[PDB]
């Protein structure tokens, strides 16, 4: 990845434009229910869709794919909450 200890992308990317999609419901709620999913991801696949270009599965966001996103946030502030880890790590994770 570029920043922060997220990453290990499996064969996919996060545009920026669905990034800002996926963040403004996370903020009304961070569970987004089964059609508020299939809503939300709608969207990000529409802001990225461009006239006369087709979208790939690379690029596509689908129900699941948005509920990838939203639990990496979840429980990366909840363990930030909790950091229930005494014992040595090795991380370069910053901040």
């Known amino acids: ?43 990000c696949n529409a802001v990225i869709q461009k006239p006369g270009k087709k979208l790939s599965d690379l690029e596509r966001v689908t129900s699941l794919k948005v509920y990838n996103w939203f639990a990496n946030r979840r429980k990366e502030i909840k363990r930030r909450a909790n950091i229930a880890a005494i014992l040595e790590s090795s991380g370069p994770s910053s901040g």
Do not use: H
Request: glycine share 10%.
């Open 1 to 43: 990845g570029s920043s922060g200890s997220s990453g290990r992308g499996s064969r996919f990317t996060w545009r920026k434009e669905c990034l800002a999609v996926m963040e403004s419901y996370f903020n009304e709620n961070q569970y987004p229910d089964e059609a508020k999913r299939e809503e939300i991801a709608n969207a």
